Amino acid sequence: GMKMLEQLEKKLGYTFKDKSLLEKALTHVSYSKKEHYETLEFLGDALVNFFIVDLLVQYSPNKREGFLSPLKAYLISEEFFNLLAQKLELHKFIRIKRGKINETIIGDVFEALWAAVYIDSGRDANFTRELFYKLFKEDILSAIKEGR
Amino acid sequence: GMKMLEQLEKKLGYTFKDKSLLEKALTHVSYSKKEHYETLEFLGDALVNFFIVDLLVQYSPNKREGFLSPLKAYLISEEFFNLLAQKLELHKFIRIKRGKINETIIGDVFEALWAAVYIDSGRDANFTRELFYKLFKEDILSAIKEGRH
Numbered sequence: 011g012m013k014m015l016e017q018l019e020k021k022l023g024y025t026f027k028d029k030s031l032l033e034k035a036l037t038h039v040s041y042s043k044k045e046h047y048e049t050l051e052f053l054g055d056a057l058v059n060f061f062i063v064d065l066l067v068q069y070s071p072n073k074r075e076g077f078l079s080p081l082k083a084y085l086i087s088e089e090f091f092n093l094l095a096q097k098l099e100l101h102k103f104i105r106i107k108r109g110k111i112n113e114t115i116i117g118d119v120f121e122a123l124w125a126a127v128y129i130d131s132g133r134d135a136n137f138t139r140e141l142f143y144k145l146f147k148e149d150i151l152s153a154i155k156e157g158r
Numbered sequence: 159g160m161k162m163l164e165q166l167e168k169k170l171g172y173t174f175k176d177k178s179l180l181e182k183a184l185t186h187v188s189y190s191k192k193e194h195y196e197t198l199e200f201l202g203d204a205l206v207n208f209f210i211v212d213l214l215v216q217y218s219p220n221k222r223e224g225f226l227s228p229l230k231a232y233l234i235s236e237e238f239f240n241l242l243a244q245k246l247e248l249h250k251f252i253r254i255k256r257g258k259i260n261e262t263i264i265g266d267v268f269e270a271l272w273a274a275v276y277i278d279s280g281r282d283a284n285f286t287r288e289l290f291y292k293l294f295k296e297d298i299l300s301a302i303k304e305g306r307h
């Protein structure tokens with residue numbers, strides 16, 4: 011919606027039913043102490059961590075946990091979440107006040123977005139995961155084979 | 159006086175399409191080096207983590223990260239995981255060698271068990287989620303209102 015949201019949604023590849031759901035995920039507490047992303051981030055943290063270990067398990071030509079922890083630490087790293095975030099230019103949609111966006115914050119909004127997509131889609135974890143793979147399964151896969 | 163190998167499906171309310179997927183989850187290295195639950199439990203960690211957290215987020219009274227976290231470390235602890243497995247008599251079904259099973263293998267088999275369901279199901283996160291909740295949604299909410307840890 012609005013003169014902005016519609017554009018994040020086309021990059022996202024998903025249009026929301028509840029627009030304020032999307033907005034809450036992009037909004038820093040500095041902007042609204044009443045409706046900001048902290049709780050969605052909490053959810054999206056577990057959600058995304060799940061999406062990525064799934065790809066990790068599914069792929070990865072080595073299956074011992076001893077191999078899986080390292081790339082995993084990377085794939086959930088703030089550095090890698092910023093990488094995927096860049097594919098949506100998320101810095102551009104975040105709602106913030108007295109202060110500037112960060113990698114960390116971009117990292118937390120990213121988890122928040124996915125939690126609201128999950129929820130907005132009626133808590134549809136299979137669709138959400140696929141949305142996620144459409145967008146990022148390519149990088150995640152290139153990552154695993156030692157992609158800087 | 160029957161149903162030794164399993165009974166566990168009727169507990170879960172789910173019949174596996176591939177039995178060796180359920181077998182794999184309940185199998186520890188000491189019994190089978192070929193297929194033990196190691197990789198599933200890795201998945202299962204992340205799987206059950208999200209089931210619990212999703213519940214936590216909608217049902218806890220305080221939606222602040224401050225209050226959610228200490229509850230969350232409880233609800234995904236081996237201790238509590240065990241209390242969830244006791245409802246499955248999971249120990250009963252584990253294919254483990256020697257005499258020491260322990261509390262770490264069990265919550266781990268608990269973890270690898272909901273990952274095997276996930277996968278057997280054709281990766282249906284939603285169905286697996288509800289299947290999970292039908293069995294423990296009860297105890298998770300409860301534990302939220304008492305608030306431990």
Ligand SMILES: [Mn+2]
Pocket residue numbers: 051055117118121
């Ligand atoms: Mn975060």
Ligand SMILES: [Mn+2]
Pocket residue numbers: 199203265266269
């Ligand atoms: Mn574990």
